[PDB]
Structures are given as structure tokens and as C-alpha cells.
Structure 1
């Protein structure tokens, strides 16, 4: 039941944080079917944040990493803040660096639901005020044309 992340759900989550903000994760999961507010928070804070550091390893970084993993053995959330990098990437390269020593049918409907919910910002009170103001002008337009049609007959 633990699902994998399609690129559609990846784009809905990025647009959700762009509007809702990083602390309203139950707001984000409402758009995002089949996914949890915990899972949404975990992906943005481990993968989708553009502040994160997914790039090549300079030899300064490799010497620093093998320094840190020797000085702070197996403390990866600590090391990932000293490296200013994501944590499982930091483990993935430390796994690789030591190996140097070798011897749409549904999704678009969700996306159509997400596309409309992000672009409707008012709530009950403003949409109702709109409805009452349109119905009040419609009553006004009705009563004025009544008076004009009676004025067509000459009776004022």
C-alpha cells in the first residue's frame, strides 16, 4: 500500500507548498490522494526542496565526509547538517566512496481537481456574498424593466 511517487504527484506537491506553505501538510494531503501528510512532509524535506544539494562530490567533500563519518560514527542526521546535504544521499556516497577500495487516465482527474482547488481562494463567505450581490442586481434589473414595460403602457 506504501506507494511510489509519480511525477504528477510530485508536481502537485510542489504547487501545493507554493501556495499553502510548508507547515500546512494536511492542506497538502487533501489535494494529494493516496498520500499522507507525513509522506508529503517527508518528501519535500528530503527530496523536493530546491535548497537541497544533489550534485557531484569534490575531493574536499569526500575528505570531509570520511573525516566526519570517522569522528561522528554513524550519526547521519548530524553529518548531513555538517555537510549541508540530504542524509540518504550522504549515506549513498559513503557507501560508494568506500567501494573505491575494491578487490494518466486517473492522474489527470486528480490534477484537474488540484488545478481548480489551487485557483479558488475565497471560501463560503466571499462566494456567498458574490451570489447575493448577483441575485440582488438581478432583482434590481427585473424591477426596473417592469417599470419601463408599464411605462410603455403609459401607466406610471
Structure 2
């Protein structure tokens, strides 16, 4: 049950988000197997979402950091927003900044599943209509060639 993330399922997510939007997660974990809403959204907001800032320091970011982190002893999500940088990264790069001080199968089947799912937009009703209508067309054409062959007998 203890899971980690393949780029397979990861991409299936980013596709899903790219459709259903952020807030409908319990659907985003339908496509995606093996996973939950809070798991999905956890990885999304904390890692995957592109708008996040993953990059180096700067002396603005650094002196800024030791400043803030000294002022607020452990309050990381606060300080994180203060840096507009992800949480555990700010924590990590921080600790490193003081570490200078020293003395392919069923995944392809799930991908068939979701990959098939996205491409149908309607819902049960519309599809039911498509059927009903076509059945009507066949009925029409039949009734016609009835009449056509009756005309080949002359009786109209």
C-alpha cells in the first residue's frame, strides 16, 4: 500500500488537473488508481504544479532566509510563503545553508483506462440518444426498401 510516484500516473494526473481543475480531486483519483484525493492534491500543490518556484538561492533569498528563520523559530509554512518558495525546500536549502557550517503492463492498461476516459464528454443520456436516433434511421431505411421492393412488384 505504501506508494511512490511514477511519471506515468504523474502525467495522468497533470492531464486530469488540466481538465477537471484543481478542486474536484475525488474524480482525479478515479482515473488515477492506487491513490487518494489528499495524496493527489498533496503532490500537486507541494510539488507538481508548475507555477511553483524551484531554483537556487540568492543573497536576497539567503540573508532574507536566515533573517526570517531567525525571527520566527520553527514556522516553516509561514516563512515559505514569505519566500514564495515551497515549504520543505525552503527548510532543506536552509539546513544545507547551515550545513556549510561544519567541524510496464497494467500501468499501460490503466493508461488505456484514463486515456479512454477523457475522450468522452457527454454522459449516459446523450449516448442513449445517439443510439435511439440511429435505430430510427435504420427503421426508416428498412421501411423504404420495403416500399421500393413493393414498387418493383408495382403495388404502391
Q: TM-score range by the shorter chain?
A: over 0.9
**Aligned-residue offset at 1:91:** 0.8
Question: What is aligned with 2:121?
Answer: 121
Cα deviation 1:13-40 (Å, max 9, x = unaligned): 0000010010000100000111011100
Cα deviation 1:46-93 (Å, max 9, x = unaligned): 011011011111121111111110111111110111111110111110
Distance 2:129 2:57 in 1: 58
Distance 1:148 1:79 in 2: 82
Question: What is aligned with 2:91?
Answer: 91
Secondary structure of the 1:50 match is coil
**Aligned-residue offset at 1:2:** 2.0
Structure 1 unaligned residues grouped into runs of 5+:
none
Cα deviation 1:71-120 (Å, max 9, x = unaligned): 11111110111111110111110111001112211111101101011111
TM value normalised by structure 1:
0.97
Structure 2 unaligned residues grouped into runs of 5+:
none
Secondary structure of the 1:24 match is helix
| 4+ aligned runs moved over 2 Å, structure 1 | none
Count how many residue pairs are aligned between Structure 1 and Structure 2. Answer: 156
Question: What is aligned with 2:29?
Answer: 29
Backbone CA RMSD of aligned residues: 0.8
TM value normalised by structure 2:
0.97
